[PDB]
Amino acid sequence: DDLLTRYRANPAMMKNLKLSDIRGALLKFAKDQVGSRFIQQELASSKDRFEKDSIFDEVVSNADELVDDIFGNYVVQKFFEYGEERHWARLVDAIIDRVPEYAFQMYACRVLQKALEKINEPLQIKILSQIRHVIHRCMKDQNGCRVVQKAIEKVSPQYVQFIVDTLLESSNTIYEMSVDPYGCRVVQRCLEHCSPSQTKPVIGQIHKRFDEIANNQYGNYVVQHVIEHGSEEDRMVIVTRVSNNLFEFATHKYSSNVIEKCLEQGAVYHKSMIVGAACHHSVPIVVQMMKDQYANYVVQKMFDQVTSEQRRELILTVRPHIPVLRQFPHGKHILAKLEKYFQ
RNA sequence: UGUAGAUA
Ligand SMILES: [Cl-]
Report how far ligand 1's centroid is from the alpha carbon of A208 (Å).
7
* For ion ligand 1, residues whose CB falls within 5 Å: A 171
CA angle A327, A215, A284 (to 5 degrees): 35
All residues at 6 or more sequence positions from A166 whose CB lies less than 8 Å from its CB, including other chains: A135, A136, A139, A173
Phi/psi at A260 (nearest 5 deg)? Answer: -60, -40
With H, G, I as helix, E, B as strand and everything else as coil, classify residue A240: helix
Q: Are A149 and A189 in contact (CB under 8 A)?
A: yes
CATH architecture for residues A3-341: Alpha Horseshoe (1.25)
What distance in Å separates the CA atoms of residue A118 and residue A85, rounded to the nearest whole number?
9
Distance CA A46, CA A214 (A): 52
Residue A42 CA to residue A61 CA, distance in Å, equals 20
Cβ neighbour number for residue A278 with a 10 Å cutoff: 29
Q: First and final CA of chain A: distance in angstroms? A: 82
Q: Which amino acid type is present at position A114? A: K
Q: DSSP characters for A9-50?
A: H-TGGGTT--GGGTGGGHHHHHTSHHHHHHHHHHHHH---HH
Experiment used for this model = X-ray
Distance CA A5, CA A117 (A): 35
Residue partners of A265: CB distance under 8 A and separation at least 6: A227, A228, A235
CA-closest candidate to residue A270, choices A317, A210, A227: A227
Cα–Cα–Cα angle for A244, A245, A251, nearest 5°? 150
Dihedral sign, Cα of residue A331, residue A261, residue A259, residue A320: positive
Residue A166 to residue A286: CA distance in whole angstroms: 42
Written as one string, the DSSP assignment of A285-343 is: HHHHHHTSTTHHHHHHHHHHHS-HHHHHHHHHHHGGGHHHHTTSTTHHHHHHHTGGG--
Instruction: In whole angstroms, give the CA distance from residue A163 to residue A13.
Output: 53
Q: How far apart are CA A274 and CA A297, in angstroms?
A: 14
Contacts of A263 (CB under 8 A, 6+ apart): A271, A274, A298, A301, A302, A305, A306
Give the closest residue to A29 by CA, choosing from A8, A43, A9, A50: A8
User: Would you say A153 and A115 are in contact if contact means Cβ atoms under 8 Å apart?
Assistant: no
Strand B nucleotides below 7 A of a protein CB?
1-8
| Subset of residues 47-66 in chain A with CB less than 7 angstroms from any atom in strand B | none
**How far is the C-alpha of A206 from the C-alpha of A201, rounded, in Å?**
9
Tell if A256 CB is < 7 Å from nucleic strand B: yes
CA distance A212 to A225: 16
Please tell me the distance between residue A168's alpha carbon and the centre of ligand 1 in angstroms: 10
Give the resolution value in Å: 1.7
Distance (angstroms) between ligand 1 centre and the Cα of A184 equals 18
Q: Say how far apart CA A186 and CA A188 lie, in whole Å.
A: 5
Could you tell me the sign of the dihedral formed by the alpha carbons of A184, A185, A189, A194, in that order? negative
Distance CA A127, CA A160 (A): 12
Per-residue CA distances from A303 to A177, A242, A265, A297, A323 (Å): 34, 17, 15, 10, 19
**Nearest residue to A182 via CA among A233, A132, A145, A154:** A145
Residue A180's contacts (CB-CB under 8 Å, 6 or more residues apart) are A140, A218
